[PDB]
Amino acid sequence: QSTQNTDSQTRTISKNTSTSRTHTSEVHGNAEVHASFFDIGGSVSAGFSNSNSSTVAIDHSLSLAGERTWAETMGLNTADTARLNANIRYVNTGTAPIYNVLPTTSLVLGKNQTLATIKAKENQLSQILAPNNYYPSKNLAPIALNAQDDFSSTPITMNYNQFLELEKTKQLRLDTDQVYGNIATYNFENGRVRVDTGSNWSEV
Amino acid sequence: QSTQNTDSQTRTISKNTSTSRTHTSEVHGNAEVHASFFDIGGSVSAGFSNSNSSTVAIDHSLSLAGERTWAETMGLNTADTARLNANIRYVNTGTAPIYNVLPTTSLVLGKNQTLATIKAKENQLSQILAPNNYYPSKNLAPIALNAQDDFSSTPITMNYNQFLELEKTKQLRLDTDQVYGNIATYNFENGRVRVDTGSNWSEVLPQIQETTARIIFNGKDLNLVERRIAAVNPSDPLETTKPDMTLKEALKIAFGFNEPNGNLQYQGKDITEFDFNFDQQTSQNIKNQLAELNATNIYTVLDKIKLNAKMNILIRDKRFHYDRNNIAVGADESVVKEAHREVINSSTEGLLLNIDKDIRKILSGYIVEIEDTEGLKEVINDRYDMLNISSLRQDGKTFIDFKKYNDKLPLYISNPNYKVNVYAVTKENTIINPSENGDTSTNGIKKILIFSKKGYEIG
């Protein structure tokens, strides 16, 4: 949205001049009946008047125009109406811990109208998820997911009709499709439990 | 935003011409009555006038229009209203150093409204974080985090409603979710300690947490010091291969404690002036061990307390009361003034006296009043914000500057007899609230009374 304010002061200085030439004819008539005690008369008259005028004129003028303009504009794109951001936590109810946790989740509207399918990026990585624990911990606030893309440079987009349906129905559900994560194994060499980045729980 | 200035000069040269043709009719009437001494007349008249005109005209015209236009425009996008930038430092309170430090942090609004979660990028890398150190060092300025893309080419974004809520509430908190970082190991080949980029402390820290007892202690300058000591889990056969750990041996090796006269001591202070705290599992196990040992005082049997894995032992100082976060804050009325009495010479501008470094951290500020012989309250400078009157010294004589508010000049002794009182406020008494109503009469709060001397005695 944008607002525009505009002021405008206009000084208009105007000149005018004029001439005019009039030519007037005229034909008059008259009749008359006079009456007295003993004197009665009558009279008939007619008149022929020509005339000719010429009017020469000139004008000067000023004008001071002050204007204040208020304007407001709201642009929109129907394909990119809304951007999303999820606040989510990770829960381990299992028995073994899982390392380098990257869940694959899904934003879904309605019955089964899937908005988007997003794999967890490097901002969303969980190094350790021990069992009976949360990532992040319960005292802390949940994490934010707002980028479908890999290098995470694109927000999660919603078009117009889905935006209207979301603000009407308020039904936006989240599915956990699959979870990536590695095993750390014991080393008999030095006792140190080390992560194999190659193996994952998907195999197991 | 953009501003536009515009000038416009317009020359309008205009022509006009005209004709007109008028056709006029007219019907006149008249009556007349004349009267004289002996002559009376009357007359009736009527007139029929036609007429016809034709007016031919022409006009020329100029116009000079000068215009100056000012314009201003402010564009905005509601999804990308604000960009953020954090100034942050890295602190190592641990014991081993960590290499190639990349913390994963989180910008959070409100209660739990998370703005963003950002992993530290290559601009934000810390090569070394030795314990008891900062990255960067304390003399230098903290580092700037302002990026989201793993390639640092996109700034962190805030929309409109969050921007309004931030400028209203000013509540923007920062969470440290997890920290990436590597171990450097010793090489027996050439002695050179080398970084394994493959291994990280993520592999190691839960192994330490699940096998040790944790003890937190704050007797060294009221600072929470955490140490984990390996202790036996009986249900794990490999874990039972360790030698047994009594509590007293653990406190000796972990905190530098000693028995210089057969009595366990931290520095010159007895262990009996420290109190113990346990979570429910550890407290239950200590209860069971004391039930088996048939003893009551734990302080007598510290050489017999068998420790186990996953224990948690908080050891604090009884004299100073603490908060929810176990930060030092302010002791009992039997502690404050019980020992803050020094024999020193009174003076103007301020009070040169030596306050113990531990004790001073529990005081938020001081209140300076003057008492009449009969007894009258004329506080020298009131309000919470001007409360702080303490300073730092180069030889150990922590000042209380009484010449802070009197026009950058000294205290007003109206009479030599006039008593000069200086009091202090425990962090649990005077609060963080600064000038809520601007009134804030310092009289209405818990004040202890440490220094009280006569002005004439001052000389």
Short characterization:
The structure is cut from a larger assembly and holds 2 copies of chain A. The first copy, chain A, is mainly β.
How would you characterize the overall build of this protein?
The structure is cut from a larger assembly and holds 2 copies of chain A. Chain A has 204 residues and is mainly beta. The first copy, chain A, is 5% helix and 63% strand. Chain A contains 1 helix and 14 strands, in the order E-E-E-E-E-E-E-E-E-E-E-E-H-E-E. Chain A has one helix at residues 160-169; strands at residues 2-35, 40-61, 64-73, 82-84, 86-88, 90-92, 98-109, 113-119, 126-129, 133-135, 143-145, 156-158, 172-185, 194-200. In chain A, strands 7, 8, 9, 13 and 14 form a 5-stranded antiparallel β-sheet that branches. A 3-stranded antiparallel β-sheet of chain A has the order 2-1-3, with no helix packed on it. In chain A, a hairpin with a 3-residue loop joins strand 7 and strand 8 (113-119). Chain A is rod-shaped and about 165 Å long. The two termini of chain A are 53 Å apart. At the A-B interface, strand 1 and strand 9 of A face strand 3, strand 4, strand 8, strand 9 and strand 14 of B. Strand 1 (2-35) of chain A pairs antiparallel with strand 4 of chain B, so a sheet runs across the interface. Chain A: The record marks 188 as: Alpha-clamp. Chain A: It is a multi-pass membrane protein. Chain A: It is found in: Host cell membrane; Host endosome membrane.
